[PDB]
């Protein structure tokens, strides 16, 4: 049974990106998924995306611009201190100059650069580069 709709979302996006598709369908599209998409859209890894309002759970159609290398969840969502963010970025990111580890902090879902600017920490959600 489904245990992480975010995991299914990012797997579907990753497979479409690998196969060269310019658009992907995501279901059931929670608001954690929506916040994750907004972060990667802010950084430019995806384009416009559309929430389909069916009366059950919703859907997302994401437009892909071929700039995404890999996106995926970190399950389980480990708690991270301030000083373990550097370790997580070293482990998960290809380089120190680009790519983002997505955190869910009490201040909200943000990327690790924004978290370090805000001096906040939370749980680890996923990555994108």
């Amino acid at each position: 049974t489904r245990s992480s709709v975010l995991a299914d979302a990012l797997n579907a996006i990753n497979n479409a990106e690998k196969t060269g598709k310019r658009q992907v369908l995501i279901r059931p599209s929670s608001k954690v998924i929506i916040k994750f998409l907004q972060v990667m859209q802010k950084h430019g890894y995806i384009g416009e995306f559309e929430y389909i309002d069916d009366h059950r759970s919703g859907k997302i159609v994401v437009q892909l611009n071929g700039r995404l290398n890999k996106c995926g969840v970190i399950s389980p969502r480990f708690n991270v201190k301030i000083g373990d963010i550097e370790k997580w970025t070293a482990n998960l990111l290809p380089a120190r100059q680009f790519g983002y580890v997505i955190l869910t902090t009490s201040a909200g879902i943000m990327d690790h650069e924004e978290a370090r600017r805000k001096h906040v920490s939370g749980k680890i959600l996923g990555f994108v580069y």
């Binding site: 399950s75 389980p76 969502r77 480990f78």
Partner: protein, 144 residues
């Protein structure tokens, strides 16, 4: 996936699984069972003293043909009987019977070395004198 639990609250399962599968290592099993203390000719020691019981000629393993000139000795501290190889050209005339020898391993923590079958120890000294010194003629074997 991966056939192992991943949840944040599965630490007990992971730790217990690691503990259970740890028993398949050799060194961990020896340490936890205390095999060196219990079942080992030495009491976990590097060296041990013994009294030579007899001189033996051990045939070499294939593809080598030789007589390896070992000694059967009985350890002082526990009375166990072991076979020790006497390493050098000659040096079996230095050993004699009823003499006191000091023994070490070959270097393979058990595990008989080379073409000598079932021999895990070597003679370092006899009658309190180093076998190397007796072979190099630096010293002489005491009468006692």
């Amino acid at each position: 996936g991966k056939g192992k639990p991943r949840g944040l609250n599965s630490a007990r399962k992971l730790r217990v699984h690691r503990r259970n599968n740890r028993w398949a290592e050799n060194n961990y099993k020896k340490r936890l069972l205390g095999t060196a203390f219990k079942s080992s000719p030495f009491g976990g020691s590097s060296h041990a003293k013994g009294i030579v019981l007899e001189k033996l000629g051990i045939e070499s393993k294939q593809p080598n043909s030789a007589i390896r000139k070992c000694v059967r000795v009985q350890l002082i501290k526990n009375g166990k009987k072991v076979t020790a190889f006497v390493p050098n050209d000659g040096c079996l005339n230095f050993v004699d019977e009823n003499d006191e020898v000091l023994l070490a391993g070959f270097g393979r923590k058990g595990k008989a070395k080379g073409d000598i079958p079932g021999v895990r120890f070597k003679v370092v000294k006899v009658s309190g004198v180093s076998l190397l010194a007796l072979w190099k003629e630096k010293k002489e074997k005491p009468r006692s």
